[PDB]
Amino acid sequence: YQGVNCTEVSNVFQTRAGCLIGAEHVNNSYECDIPIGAGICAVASQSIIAYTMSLGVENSVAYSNNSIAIPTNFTISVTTEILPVSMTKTSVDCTMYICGDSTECSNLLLQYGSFCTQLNRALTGIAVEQDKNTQEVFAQVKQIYKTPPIKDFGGFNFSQILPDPSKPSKRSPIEDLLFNKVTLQKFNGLTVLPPLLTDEMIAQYTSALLAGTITSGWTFGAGPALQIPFPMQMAYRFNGIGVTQNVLYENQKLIANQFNSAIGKIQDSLSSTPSALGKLQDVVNQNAQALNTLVKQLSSNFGAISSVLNDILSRLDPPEAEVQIDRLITGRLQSLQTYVTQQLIRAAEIRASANLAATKMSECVLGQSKRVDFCGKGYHLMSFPQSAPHGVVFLHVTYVPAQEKNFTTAPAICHDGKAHFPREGVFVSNGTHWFVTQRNFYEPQIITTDNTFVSGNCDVVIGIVNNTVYDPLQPELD
């Protein structure tokens, strides 16, 4: 009970958000499952429990004077991001929604002016811009690219996202299970216009995007499609996040196996997880609910003697029928005006989501992204477009670091009165000897003149250790 105290009416607990009856108050916190309000959330141990939500597991990271944690491994992972781009192109008829087949109330409808024409123009503008949203998202290639007939990608498997020739609709298994996951009025003068791009043509656009990115990298989104070997493409996508390309050429089989496992978990997660297609089910449910209340508002009287127009025109002559006619036209007209207003407010949100989806297509699919948490959690490498009914699904392949060691560091190394700073990466030490490794992977190297640069002397940096910087020039001359 929201806005009351617990003084007015099996267990009664007082919350800040109101009086809650039926839930036991448990002291320890959990992750929030059903929100109530003011931090209190709510089944566990065959009873309804009430608790303050937990904000995540709490850990204190061991901040030290001189230590960096650097990963020794990595887990490449694929995350799904699901964004709606369009709605149903609905359009109504003014005189058939308000009146129907009656000229003697059509003459009273012409006394209201262009109230038909404004709502028809607004719904026509929505129906034009919903095709513009789909064109702006999916129509980003100049040319339709096709996959090679053999699939030798260095170990990488793409059969879950490439379209299947055995399928009669020419779709991938992931796109097919996206089509089989969502479930979906045209009676009194309201029509549903079909979209300009059908689902086969949208799947052809996503297949052109997919074949273009696995064949070319980011070059086809910029200029002409320049072909690449796909391990060399993934190595150059490692080279944009701060990992050198030798890590992939030593760990290519592990990268391909972890990528195929992470891709194969996507179909299982979308098949098993309930309400995974929530943002695409919600727009269809909202459009169907608005359409259903648009149909259902004809049954209202609006102060008239009957909701059906035909019997009151059958049982009253016009100079006292027109009082009931004007009330029915006023109620149905302002109901339709309310519907067009809520559809415009919803279409602005769908326009913003389609702009976000086109932006995420442009700098997650067509290129590589340096802005973090925009193309998935972790260091982004590339992503996969997947078509969806009134939406688009991005399969964000990201670089997530695995297990790490804690080490000990120093920001500079003094050698013969000269302070040496690393060019790429940092100095690390495992207790005795010092090495140079990159930041996102533990690849320790001997400190040389090649990977370090010198600036100033050893009195300006507040923490310096003393080691020997070994150049190859002295042994290759001696």
Partner 1 sequence: YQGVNCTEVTGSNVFQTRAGCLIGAEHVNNSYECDIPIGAGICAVASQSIIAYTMSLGVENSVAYSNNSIAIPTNFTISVTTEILPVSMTKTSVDCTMYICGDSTECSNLLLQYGSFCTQLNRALTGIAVEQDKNTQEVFAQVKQIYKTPPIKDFGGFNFSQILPDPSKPSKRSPIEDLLFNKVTLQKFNGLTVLPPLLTDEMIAQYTSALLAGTITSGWTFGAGPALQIPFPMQMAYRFNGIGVTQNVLYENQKLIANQFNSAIGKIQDSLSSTPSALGKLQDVVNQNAQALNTLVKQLSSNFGAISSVLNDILSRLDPPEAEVQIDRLITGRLQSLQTYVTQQLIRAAEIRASANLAATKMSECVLGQSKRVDFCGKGYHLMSFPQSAPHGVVFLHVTYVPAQEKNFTTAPAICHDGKAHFPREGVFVSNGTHWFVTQRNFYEPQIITTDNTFVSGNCDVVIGIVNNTVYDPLQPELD
Ligand X SMILES: *[C@@H]1O[C@H](CO)[C@@H](O)[C@H](O)[C@H]1NC(C)=O
Ligand Y SMILES: *[C@@H]1O[C@H](CO)[C@@H](O[C@@H]2O[C@H](CO)[C@@H](O)[C@H](O)[C@H]2NC(C)=O)[C@H](O)[C@H]1NC(C)=O
Would you tell me which residues interact with ligand Y (CB under 6 A)?
Answer: 62, 72-73, 75, 157, 159, 254, 257-258, 404-406
* C-alpha to C-alpha distance for 152 and 130, rounded to whole angstroms: 39
Q: Applying CB under 8 A, does 345 fall inside the site for partner 1?
A: yes
Give the neighbor-by-neighbor strand order of the sheet with 74-84.
74-84, 391-401, 379-388
**Partner touching 113 among ligand X, partner 1, ligand Y, none, CB below 5 to 8 Å by kind:** partner 1
Both tokens assigned to 470: 């070994």
Binding mask 93-132 for ligand X (x = CB under 6 A): ----------------------------------------
Q: Is residue 82 a contact partner of residue 303, using CB atoms and an 8 Å limit? A: no
Residues 5-34 that bind partner 1 (CB under 8 A): 16-17, 32
Q: Please compute Rg for the chain using Cα positions.
A: 32
CA angle in degrees (0–180, nearest 5) for 145-158-379: 95
Which of 212/391 has CB closer to partner 1? 212
Residues 305-344 that bind partner 1 (CB under 8 A): 326, 331, 334-335, 337-338, 341-342, 344
Residues 7-46 that bind ligand X (CB under 6 A): 7, 27
| DSSP 3-state of 345 | helix
Residues 282-341 that bind ligand X (CB under 6 A): none
Q: Is residue 123 a contact partner of residue 336, using CB atoms and an 8 Å limit? A: no
User: Residue type for 35, please?
Assistant: P
**Partner touching 265 among ligand X, partner 1, ligand Y, none, CB below 5 to 8 Å by kind:** none
Residues 124-143 that bind partner 1 (CB under 8 A): 131, 139-143
- Exactly one of 424, 466, 468, 471 binds ligand X (CB under 6 A); which one? 466
C-alpha dist (Å) from residue 281 to 147, 201, 391, 409, 473: 32, 22, 10, 52, 67
Q: Applying CB under 8 A, does 152 fall inside the site for partner 1?
A: yes
Q: Applying CB under 8 A, does 391 fall inside the site for partner 1?
A: no
Q: Applying CB under 8 A, does 96 fall inside the site for partner 1?
A: no
* C-alpha to C-alpha distance for 222 and 249, rounded to whole angstroms: 27
Which of 139/254 has CB closer to ligand Y? 254
Binding mask 443-462 for ligand X (x = CB under 6 A): -------------------x
* C-alpha to C-alpha distance for 147 and 78, rounded to whole angstroms: 21
- Report the nearest approach of ligand X to the CB of residue 473 (Å): 24
Which of 70/94 has CB closer to ligand Y? 70
Nearest to 175 by CA among 389, 27, 12: 389
Q: Applying CB under 6 A, does 432 fall inside the site for ligand X?
A: no
- Report the nearest approach of ligand Y to the CB of residue 346 (Å): 38
- Exactly one of 226, 271, 285, 318 binds partner 1 (CB under 8 A); which one? 226
- Report the nearest approach of ligand X to the CB of residue 412 (Å): 10
Cβ within 8 Å of residue 84, ≥6 positions away: 279, 280, 283, 350, 353, 354, 357, 390, 391
| DSSP 3-state of 74 | strand
Q: Applying CB under 8 A, does 107 fall inside the site for partner 1?
A: no
* C-alpha to C-alpha distance for 296 and 228, rounded to whole angstroms: 58
* C-alpha to C-alpha distance for 365 and 351, rounded to whole angstroms: 20
Q: Applying CB under 6 A, does 150 fall inside the site for ligand X?
A: no
User: Residue type for 408, please?
Assistant: T
Q: 428: part of which helix (H) or strand (E)?
A: strand 426-429
- Report the nearest approach of partner 1 to the CB of residue 286 (Å): 8
Binding mask 56-75 for ligand X (x = CB under 6 A): ---------xx---------
Which of 337/429 has CB closer to partner 1? 337
Both tokens assigned to 295: 């149909």
Q: Is residue 23 a contact partner of residue 48, using CB atoms and an 8 Å limit? A: yes
Cβ within 8 Å of residue 59, ≥6 positions away: none
**Partner touching 5 among ligand X, ligand Y, partner 1, none, CB below 5 to 8 Å by kind:** ligand X
Residue with the CB atom nearest ligand Y in the bound state:
406
**Partner touching 7 among ligand Y, partner 1, ligand X, none, CB below 5 to 8 Å by kind:** ligand X
Question: Which residues sit at the interface with ligand X, rule CB under 6 A?
Answer: 5, 7, 27, 65-66, 152, 462-463, 466
